[PDB]
């Protein structure tokens, strides 16, 4: 009965807040903590706070760099991360404690949020764009980061290209189209070729 | 404290005379500011308490106002100068809707093409349909597209080419993204085009789905 | 100059805090502001901070949840932005404000970084995986978000049927595989193709596998 | 405190006992948990205070101890049972390194099979080749990757499917994925698997890059 939200891509040197919502008990009589899985590996203690926010602890190795606070009004609780690298990437649980036989034990859980800490890199996709004055064209479509260099005819094509500036589209990824104003007779008798160079994917491509 | 700027759009040649106004609804004495934004980048600043110049501010930039009124101008107005200006209430932050400078010229329609989506696209399983203006003006053109007799907006993103110097035209492309399902269904596919020279709606269409 | 970072996608109805870092000037004696602009539409000021933070200002639409921050000791400056909605789409930039004729003038900018609240969806891209005992599969690529349904035969092949978990790949899009065991005699004779459905863009792919 | 935990890896077949230890550094008195997550599950708590079971947990789970050394006993191991466990020390909350708990069975080889890159994927530009482990135990395998008898190091995904119930055996996808340009300037692509059930290593290859 304890849902978690917040998590997502950040990049090495971000800041992520994540978020655990409770629902069918007390949330404000109840002591929370906070505990992580990376990939492939055990799972490990990261934070602990009392349910008036008198007690709270915390790991270590995450010192200086994590906070834990909730709102018991809004049945919250939350895991502010800050300085985040690649060993932070882990999937976070939200967990309620109880004290029995003077002990601190874990009995419910929450489903998880993924946090991922890395560079976003993805090469473009280029696709074709053919139809007396003729246009063609080249899409580059799904790439990331923005920064992509369309050329034709290696640099032998000039203005009749128009390079339309690139877009963010649903996919969070970004695409632009490359056109150009070419003869008809041309269609038949010469092949048209755009050099779409991505260097963060370190991809250069050649297409018709 | 409401501030009104004029004209919404301009249009003005290298060598003319520019004026853009700006009105408070209450006197503002001179706490009035202006700034500079090219098109996709960060805003400049001009001119400060209405009549004082920025460091690196041409000075063929001038400003003049008092109270209510106020005014900015641009003597001799150069390719570098064309871009969106806006007023900003200095003691309130309020900034203004702003006044966009683009090249004068003589309306020219737009040259439509539709381009079907790529073989090789298709058999990820993702097909996207563009639409090409050319070289048109105005910049304002209204695009529609209808997919077989009609289909309605939600999948297309488009974009705009920033007015080219030899020319002083723009061109559109609108981007329609289908899936490879939704599209083979479909057979017809269309973009309308609607434009200042465009006495009748251009429509360019292909069939294959 | 003046360094921003933080911006990205958000989740609607989620949280980003902006950053903005400074150089070259004295970040403590300074004021500094933020300003935001939505896609295709003019400046919008939200917030200012004083030097020593003894006055801050919020644009009264975003009061209760915006909060601006800063520490001089870092140079640094932020802005936590909360309940976050589509109308917040904007490129924020960070500029710092100079008093001048006993008024407010913002002289120095950041290039600005993006902040679009939107949920991410792409759809999967399938690929087929060409082969007496003979192995087919198909390949569900560059997919968001979770989850993905594969099916054979329009769910008549179970058998042999290895839909391999979802692996996160450097796009940040997940990658899964399903194979399927099949006899070698069949490959002539029968066709197989995988069914692919991805209810978050509710995309249906279906896409036959032959031998290569 | 310091715990370690052994085994850290059991195979166990439905209805034996399973007998797995947890050992502090100093004595805990009974501030003991465990837990156990199945695959792509949330941890739940099966012990507490060493001793305590958690309400809806099968008695036949059990835990003892006292001090430095515990227990956790389950008594008849069921198809649910066979998961991962973890100890936690209640006062500190620090958990221990886990046991993976799996269905035991005779050692089986994999079966394995190379996927050339599909045209229709070079067309957009990118190249996947994909090889597959199959039916296979143990669990443990090493995947190789040579294009030109030279080895690739950061360009390979692997992913292996959970422990079927009828059959007890394991199954692995390794994926290596290149640029376009990069697949089309080598020729031969190949993987190499090494397992307990092969006696030498098997390799799958194919040309035509």
């Known amino acids: 009965q304890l849902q978690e939200s917040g998590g997502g891509l950040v990049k090495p040197g971000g800041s992520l807040r994540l978020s655990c919502t409770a629902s069918?008990?007390?949330?404000?009589?109840?002591?929370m903590n906070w505990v992580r899985q990376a990939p492939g590996k055990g799972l490990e203690w990261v934070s602990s706070i009392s349910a008036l926010s008198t007690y709270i602890y915390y790991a270590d190795s995450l010192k200086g760099r994590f906070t834990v606070s909730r709102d018991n009004a809004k049945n919250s609780l939350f895991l502010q991360m800050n300085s985040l690298r690649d060993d932070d990437t882990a999937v976070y649980y939200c967990?309620?404690?109880?004290?029995?036989?003077?002990?601190?034990?874990?009995?419910?859980w929450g489903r998880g949020t993924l946090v991922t800490v890395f560079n976003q890199i993805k090469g473009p996709s280029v696709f074709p764009l053919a139809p007396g004055t003729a246009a063609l064209g080249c899409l580059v479509k799904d790439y990331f980061p923005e920064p992509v260099t369309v050329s034709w005819n290696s640099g032998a094509l000039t203005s009749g290209v128009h390079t339309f500036p690139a877009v963010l589209q649903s996919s969070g990824l970004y695409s632009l189209s490359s056109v150009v104003t070419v003869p008809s007779s041309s269609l038949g008798t010469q092949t048209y070729i755009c050099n779409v160079n991505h260097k963060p994917s370190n991809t250069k491509v050649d297409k018709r | 404290i409401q501030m009104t700027q004029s004209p919404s759009s301009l249009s003005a040649s290298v060598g003319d005379r520019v004026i853009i106004t700006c009105?408070?609804?209450?006197?503002?004495?001179?706490?009035?500011?202006?700034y500079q934004q090219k098109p996709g980048k960060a805003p400049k600043l001009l001119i400060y308490a209405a009549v004082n110049l920025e460091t690196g501010v041409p000075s063929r930039f001038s400003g003049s106002g008092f109270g209510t009124d106020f005014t900015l101008a641009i003597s001799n107005v150069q390719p570098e100068d064309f871009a969106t200006?806006?007023?900003?209430?200095?003691?309130?932050?309020?900034?203004?809707?702003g006044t966009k400078l683009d090249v004068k010229r003589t309306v020219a329609a737009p040259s439509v093409f539709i381009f079907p989506p790529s073989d090789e696209q298709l058999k990820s399983g993702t097909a996207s349909v563009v639409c090409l203006l050319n070289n048109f003006y105005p910049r304002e053109a209204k695009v529609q597209w209808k997919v077989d007799n009609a289909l309605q907006s939600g999948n297309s993103q488009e974009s705009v080419t920033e007015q080219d110097s030899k020319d002083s035209t723009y061109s559109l492309s609108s981007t329609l993204t289908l899936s490879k399902a939704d599209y083979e269904k479909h057979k017809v596919y269309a973009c309308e085009v609607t434009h200042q020279g465009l006495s009748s709606p251009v429509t360019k269409s292909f069939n294959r789905g | 100059q003046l360094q921003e970072s933080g911006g990205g996608l958000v989740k609607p109805g989620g949280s980003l805090r902006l950053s903005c870092?400074?150089?070259?000037?004295?970040?403590?004696?300074?004021?500094?502001?933020?300003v935001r602009q939505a896609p295709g539409k003019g400046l919008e000021w939200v917030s200012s901070i004083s030097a020593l933070s003894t006055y801050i200002y919020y644009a009264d639409s975003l009061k209760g949840r915006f909060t601006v921050s800063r520490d001089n000791a870092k140079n640094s400056l932020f802005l936590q932005m909360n309940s976050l909605r589509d109308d917040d789409t904007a490129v924020?930039?960070?500029?710092?404000?100079?008093?001048?004729?006993?008024?407010?003038?913002?002289?120095?900018?950041?290039?600005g970084t993006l902040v679009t609240v939107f949920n991410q969806i792409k759809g999967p891209s399938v690929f087929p995986l060409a082969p007496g005992t003979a192995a087919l599969g198909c390949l569900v690529k560059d997919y968001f978000p979770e989850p993905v349904t594969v099916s054979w035969n329009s769910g008549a092949l179970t058998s042999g049927v290895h839909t391999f978990p979802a692996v996160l790949q450097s796009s940040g899009l997940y990658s899964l595989s399903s194979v399927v065991t099949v006899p070698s005699s069949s490959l002539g004779t029968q066709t197989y193709i995988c069914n692919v459905n991805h209810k978050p863009s509710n995309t249906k792919v279906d896409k036959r596998v032959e031998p290569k | 405190i310091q715990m370690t935990q052994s085994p850290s890896s059991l195979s166990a077949s439905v209805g034996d006992r399973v007998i797995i230890t947890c050992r502090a550094s100093?004595?805990?008195?009974?501030?003991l948990n465990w837990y156990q997550q199945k695959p792509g599950k949330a941890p739940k708590l099966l012990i507490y205070a060493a001793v305590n079971l958690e309400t809806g947990v099968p008695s036949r789970f059990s835990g003892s101890g006292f001090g430095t050394d515990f227990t956790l006993a389950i008594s008849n191991v069921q198809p649910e049972d066979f998961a991962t466990y973890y100890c936690?020390?209640?006062?500190?909350?620090?958990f221990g390194r886990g046991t993976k708990l799996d269905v035991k069975r005779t050692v089986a080889a994999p079966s394995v099979f190379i996927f050339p890159p599909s045209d229709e994927q070079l067309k957009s530009g990118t190249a996947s080749v994909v090889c597959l482990l199959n039916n296979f135990y143990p669990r443990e395998a090493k995947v190789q990757w040579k294009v030109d008898n030279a080895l690739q190091s950061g360009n390979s995904q692997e992913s292996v499917t959970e422990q079927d119930s009828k059959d007890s055996t394991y199954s692995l996808s390794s994926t290596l994925t290149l640029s376009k340009a990069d697949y089309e300037k080598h020729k031969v692509y190949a993987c190499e698997v090494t397992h307990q059930g092969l006696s030498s290593p098997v390799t799958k290859s194919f040309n035509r890059g």
């Open positions: 100093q004595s805990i008195s009974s501030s």
């Open positions: 069918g008990f007390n949330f404000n009589k109840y002591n």
């Open positions: 967990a309620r404690e109880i004290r029995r036989a003077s002990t601190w034990s874990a009995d419910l």
């Open positions: 936690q020390q209640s006062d500190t909350r620090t």
